[PDB]
Write a protein that binds this ligand. Structure first.
Ligand SMILES: CCCCCCCCCCO[C@@H]1O[C@H](CO)[C@@H](O[C@H]2O[C@H](CO)[C@@H](O)[C@H](O)[C@H]2O)[C@H](O)[C@H]1O
Ligand SMILES: CCCCCCCCCCO[C@@H]1O[C@H](CO)[C@@H](O[C@H]2O[C@H](CO)[C@@H](O)[C@H](O)[C@H]2O)[C@H](O)[C@H]1O
Ligand SMILES: CCCCCCCCCCO[C@@H]1O[C@H](CO)[C@@H](O[C@H]2O[C@H](CO)[C@@H](O)[C@H](O)[C@H]2O)[C@H](O)[C@H]1O
Ligand SMILES: Nc1ncnc2c1ncn2[C@@H]1O[C@H](CO)[C@@H](O)[C@H]1O
Ligand SMILES: Nc1ncnc2c1ncn2[C@@H]1O[C@H](CO)[C@@H](O)[C@H]1O
Ligand SMILES: Nc1ncnc2c1ncn2[C@@H]1O[C@H](CO)[C@@H](O)[C@H]1O
Ligand code: NA
Ligand code: NA
Ligand code: NA
Lengths: 404, 404, 404
C-alpha cells in the first residue's frame, strides 16, 4: 500500500547517496529540510483541504490566462482553431501547430511583462529567501531554484548572473539541477493545452525547487565556501513574444523530426525483432519493459507499470515534450488503455521536468554564456545533473502518488 | 464645419511649437513650405479631379501587384486560401496567417528587386531633391524622407548611410521622425489585404514625407551646420523574401501575444472596474474615453469620437498593426458600429504610421547600427520623435478629413 | 533515334572544352573515366536488370523513410494533412506548406543522425575512394564529390574542411561544381513528395558525383600540385531538425515570392507583348522558345521540346525548386500537356541540381566560411562553376534519355 511508496523514496535517496561526490560532506540540515519541504508541500496541496483550494485556485487562474491568450491565436488562424474543425475532421480537427504552439508565444511574452513590472522578482525573492534560511543554501542558488518554478533552465540563473562566474562547483551543480528538475511557464501552458491537468503541472513546478536542491546537495554537497532591460512594458512584451516564437519553431521542428524518427525506429525494430520471433517489436515495448520496474517503484500498479514505463522512458531518452505527446491521448476518452487516476498523476509528475541529455547542450549554451570559463565544469557535471534532475521528478512523482 | 478642421491644424502645430527645442530657430521657409506641400498634396489627390485619378491609378496598380503576389501564397497554402474556406468556416474562413502575412514576404522581395534595378533610387532622388530645394532641408534628410514613403524606418536611411554618423542632431531627429511618421510598403499591402482602402494608405505614405519634415523642423530646428548589394536580381529577390519572412514571423508572433495580452487586460479590468461599479470596463473604453477629444479635434463627429479614439489610442500605446486589426472589422458589412465614410478615412490616416514607443528600440537597433556612437542621441530624442511622428499622422488625418 | 543523344553528349563535352581554362592541360584519364563512370552508372541502373532492381530497392527504402517521417507532420498539422482535405477542397486539399516542407526538417535530422553514427562517412569514404583511384583526382575533391550525392553544396565540403583553405584552384572549382551539379537529401525527399519519381532523383544524385568531376576537370584541369560534433545522437537529431527548419522557412518564403514575382512578370509581359501583337506573352513562352533547342538537343521530341524548355529554363534563370513546382502538375492525371514517359525522365534529370546563379552566393557564405581568404576565387569561378554544374545535369539527362 503506502509502504511501497515510502520504500521508493528511500531508494531514490539511496541512489543519490551512492552517486554522491562526498557522502561525509552531506549537510543533514540541508538535505533533511529539502526533502521535508518537498514532502510537506506535497502534503499541503494534494492532501489537506486548504492547500487543495489554493492549488485549484492558482490552476484556474492559469487556465483563464491561457484562454485569454487564445484570443490572439484565434485572430491569426481564424476558423482553423474553431469548433467547426471537429465537425469536419473529427478528432483530427485539433491542429497541434495552431492550438498548442502559439501558447508558448503568449506566455513567454506575459512572463517578460511580469518581469518588467517586478512582479516575478518579488515572488522569487520570497520563495528563494525562504529556502536559503531553511536549508542553509547560498543566496544565489536559492534564487535560481525559486526562479526555475516559473521560467526555463537558462532563463532562471539570469536573476543572479553576476554571481554565476564565481560560484562554487556545488553551487553551479545546484543551478544546473534546478533547471533540469523543472520546466518553464511557456511549455507548462502548452502541456495544459494537451490535456495534462494543470494542478499537476503547477504542483510539480513548485516541488521542483526544493527537490532540485535536495538531490543536488545529495549528489554534490558544498565542500567549498560561497560568497555574499527593455525600455518599456510594450518592448518587454514584444521581446518575450519573439523569444516564444523562436522556441515555438524549435519545439515544432523537434516534434516533427523526433516522432518521425521514432516511426522510422519502429519500422526497423519490426524487422530486427522479427529475426528473433518478435515482429511486433517497437520502441514503446522496449522503453516499457525497461522502465516498468522504475515505474512500479514510484507507485504505479503492477498491471500498469509497463504502460507507464513507456512514457517515463521516452521522457528520459528524449525529452518530456515527446513523452507528453504520446501520453496526451491517454488523458482522453479515446485512450487505448484506461489508466487509474493515481497512475495518470504519477506519470504527469515524473514527466514534468527538463531532465534529459539534450538539455546539457542547452545549459552549455545559455548558462555557459553567463560564465564562459565554466563551460568545462558544466559539461563535466552534465550527466550527474541530469540524474539528479531525474531523481527529483521521480521523487515528486512518488510523493504525489503517496497522497493519492 | 470646416472651421473645426482648420483649428485642429493650428492646435497640432501649436503643440509642436510649445514642445520645440528652440522656437526662435524655426525656419519659416522650411516649416511653412512643409505644411504647404503636405496640404497641397492632400488637396491634390483627395479633392481635385486629376489628382484623384492619379491616386486611384496608383492604388489599382498596387492592388494588382498584391493579387499577383497572391499566386505564391496560393501555391503554398493551397485550398486554405481558397473560396471553399468561406463555404465551410463562413467568416472565420479568412485565415490571417495565410492571407495577410505572406504579402509581407512578396512585397519585401519586390522592393528589393526594384532597388537592384535602380528604380527605387530613381524615384527617391526626384522626390528627395524636390524637398530640399523647396524646404531648404539638407540632402541626406530629404532623401531619407522620400525613401520612407516606400520602405521602413530602418531601411530608409540606408540610401544615405555614410552621412548618418556625422549628421547634426536636427538631421538625425528628422531621420527618426521620417520613419515614425510613415510605414513600409510591405505592411501597407498587408493592411490593404485587411480591408483598408489603398487610396488612403498610399496618400498617407506620400504625405508622411513633408509631414515628417514639418514636425521635425518644428520640434527640432536646425541650429548647427550640415555637410554636403546582391550579385544579381534573383539574389536581390531571394534576399528580400528572407527579410520579409523574418518580419512576417515577428509581426505574427506580436499579434498573437498583444491581442492575447489585451484579452488578459480586459479580463482584469472587468474585475477591477467592478469594484467601482463598472464591470463592463475594458481597454477599448479607456482608450476611447481618453482619445475622444483628440479624435474630435482632428475632424471626427461627436457621436463617433469615442469609437474612433479606441483605434487611435491603441495605435499609440501599442502599434498601428494591432490598431488596424481591431479597425478592420469596422470596414466590412458585419461592423458593430456603422461609421461615416469621412470617419473611416480619418482613422485610416491617423493610424498610418510607425509612431510608437516600441519603434524607438527598432531605431536604436537598425538606425543605431549605421551610427554606433549616435545611439545616445537616438534614445534621447526618441520620445520627442514619436510625438513629432504622431502629430504628422494626426495632421495628415486632419487634412484628409478636411477635403472630404 | 539514339544518334541524336550521342551527338548531344558530344556537344555538351564540346562546349566544356571550348570554355576550358586550358585544353592542353586536360587529363584524358580523368575526364575519360569520369564520363565513362557516369555513362556506365546510367547504363547500370537504367538499362540492365540487376541495376534496376538495386535502384528500385533503394528508392522504395527512401519512400518508406519519407512515410515514416510523415508521422511527425501528421501529429503537428493533424487533419490538415489527412484524406478529408481532398473530400473538402478537392485538388486544393494538398497543402504544400504542410505536406512537402516538413519533409525537409525530418530528413535533415535523419542525415544528421547518420553522420553521428558514422554511417554517412563510411559510404562517402568508399565512393570517394573509388573515384580518386579511377580518375586520379585528389583525396579531398573526391570525398566532396561523393558527399554531394547525399547532402547539400555547403554541407559536403565539411568532411574535408581542413583541406579547403589550401586546395588548388582546380580543386576548389571541382568542389564548387560538385555541389552545383547535385542536390541535397532533404530537398530530394521534398521533390519526391511533389510527384517526382524517386528513381530519377536517386539516379541523378549518384550520377552527379562523376558528372560533377567530369565538367570540372574539363573546364578547369589541374595545373598545380595538390596535397595529401554533437554530444549524443539525440543532440545530432535536434540539431539537424533546426537546420531543416531554417531551410524549410527559407524555401517556403522563396516560393511565395518567386511564384508571385513570376505572376507579376507575366502580367507585365501580357501588356508589353501586346504592343507587338502578342498579348498572350508570358515567361513560360519565352523560356520555352529559348530553351527548346537545348531540350531538343538532349533527347526531347520536337513536339515536346518547347514545353520541356519551360522547365529547364526556369531551373536555370531561377532555381530547380521553382521549376519542379511548375513541373509537378505535369506528373499527374490533371496535366495540361500529356508528355511521353521518356520526356518526363529527361526533365527530371535536367532539373536535379543546384546549378544556378543564386547558389554562388550560398557558396560564398557556407563554403566561403571554410576558407575566408578564398572568397575571391569562389566569386571569380562562380559563373563557370554554374555552367559546369549545368552541363552535368544536361549530360545526366542525355544519358538517362539514351537508355530509355
Ligand atoms: C496594450 C495596451 C497596454 C497599455 C499600457 C501603456 C504602457 C506605457 C509605456 C511607457 O513606459 C515608458 O516608456 C519610455 C520609452 O521607452 C521609457 O523611457 C525610456 O526611454 C526613453 C527614451 O526613449 C528615455 O528618455 C528614458 O530615460 C527611458 O527610461 C520609460 O522608462 C517607460 O517608463
Ligand atoms: C523568374 C525569372 C526571371 C528571369 C531574369 C533573369 C536574371 C539574370 C541575372 C543575371 O545577372 C548577373 O548575374 C551575375 C552573377 O551573380 C552577376 O555577376 C556578379 O557575380 C559574378 C560571379 O559570380 C562576377 O563575375 C561578376 O563580376 C559580378 O558582377 C552580374 O552582376 C549580374 O549582371
Ligand atoms: C527516440 C529514442 C531513441 C533512443 C536512443 C538513446 C540514445 C542515448 C544517447 C547517449 O549518448 C551519450 O550521451 C552523452 C551525453 O551527451 C555523451 O557524453 C558526452 O557528454 C558528457 C557530459 O555531458 C561527457 O561526460 C562525455 O565525455 C561526452 O562524450 C556521450 O558521448 C554519448 O555516448
Ligand atoms: N524555456 C526553455 N528553456 C530551455 N530549454 C527549454 C525550454 N523549453 C523547452 N526546452 C527544451 O526543450 C525540451 C522539450 O520541452 C526540454 O526538455 C528542454 O531541453
Ligand atoms: N519595415 C519595418 N521596419 C521597421 N519596423 C517595422 C517595419 N514593419 C513593421 N515594423 C514595426 O512593427 C510595428 C507594427 O507594424 C511598427 O509600428 C514598427 O514598430
Ligand atoms: N541543402 C542545401 N544547401 C544549400 N543550398 C540549398 C540546399 N537546399 C536548397 N538550397 C538552395 O535552394 C535552391 C532551391 O532548392 C537551390 O538551388 C539552392 O540554391
Ligand atoms: Na525551470
Ligand atoms: Na517609412
Ligand atoms: Na550535393
Amino acid at each position: 500500500s503506502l509502504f511501497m511508496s515510502c520504500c521508493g523514496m528511500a531508494v531514490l535517496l539511496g541512489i543519490a547517496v551512492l552517486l554522491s561526490s562526498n557522502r561525509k560532506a552531506i549537510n543533514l540540515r540541508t538535505v533533511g529540510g529539502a526533502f521535508a519541504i518537498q514532502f510537506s508541500l506535497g502534503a499541503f496541496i494534494l492532501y489537506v483541504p486548504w492547500g487543495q483550494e489554493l492549488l485549484r485556485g492558482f490552476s484556474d487562474a492559469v487556465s483563464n490566462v491561457i484562454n485569454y491568450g487564445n484570443d490572439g491565436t484565434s485572430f491569426l488562424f481564424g476558423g482553423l482553431v474553431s469548433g467547426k474543425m471537429f465537425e469536419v475532421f473529427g478528432g483530427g480537427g485539433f491542429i497541434f501547430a495552431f492550438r498548442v504552439l502559439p501558447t508558448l508565444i503568449f506566455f513567454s511574452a506575459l512572463i517578460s511583462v511580469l518581469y518588467y513590472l517586478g512582479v516575478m522578482q518579488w515572488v522569487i525573492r520570497i520563495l528563494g529567501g525562504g529556502l536559503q534560511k531553511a536549508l542553509g543554501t547560498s543566496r544565489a542558488e536559492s534564487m535560481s531554484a525559486a526562479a526555475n518554478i516559473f521560467v526555463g533552465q537558462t532563463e532562471a540563473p539570469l536573476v543572479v548572473r553576476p554571481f554565476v562566474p564565481k560560484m562554487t562547483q556545488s553551487e553551479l551543480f545546484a543551478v544546473m539541477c534546478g533547471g533540469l528538475a523543472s520546466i518553464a511557464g511557456g511549455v507548462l501552458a502548452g502541456y495544459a493545452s494537451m490535456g495534462v491537468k494543470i494542478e499537476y503541472l503547477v504542483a510539480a513546478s513548485f516541488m521542483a525547487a526544493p527537490g532540485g536542491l535536495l538531490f543536488a546537495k545529495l549528489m554534490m554537497p558544498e565542500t567549498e565556501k560561497p560568497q555574499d532591460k527593455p525600455a518599456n512594458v510594450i518592448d518587454a512584451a514584444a521581446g518575450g513574444a519573439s523569444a516564444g516564437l523562436q522556441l515555438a519553431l524549435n519545439v515544432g521542428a523537434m516534434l516533427i523530426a523526433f516522432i518521425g524518427l521514432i516511426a522510422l525506429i519502429n519500422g526497423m525494430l519490426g524487422g530486427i525483432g522479427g529475426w528473433f520471433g518478435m515482429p511486433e517489436l517497437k520502441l514503446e515495448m522496449l522503453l516499457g519493459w525497461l522502465f516498468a520496474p522504475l515505474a512500479f517503484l514510484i507507485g504505479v500498479p503492477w498491471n500498469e507499470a509497463t504502460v507507464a514505463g513507456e512514457f517515463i522512458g521516452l521522457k528520459t531518452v528524449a525529452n518530456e515534450f515527446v513523452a507528453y505527446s504520446q501520453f496526451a491521448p491517454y488523458l482522453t476518452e479515446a485512450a487505448p488503455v484506461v489508466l487509474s487516476e493515481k497512475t495518470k498523476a504519477i506519470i504527469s509528475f515524473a514527466l514534468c521536468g527538463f531532465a534529459n541529455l539534450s538539455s546539457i547542450a542547452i545549459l552549455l549554451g545559455g548558462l555557459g554564456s553567463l560564465a564562459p570559463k565554466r563551460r568545462g565544469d558544466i559539461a563535466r557535471m552534465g550527466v550527474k545533473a541530469v540524474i539528479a534532475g531525474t531523481l527529483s521528478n521521480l521523487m515528486a512523482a512518488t510523493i504525489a502518488g503517496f497522497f493519492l
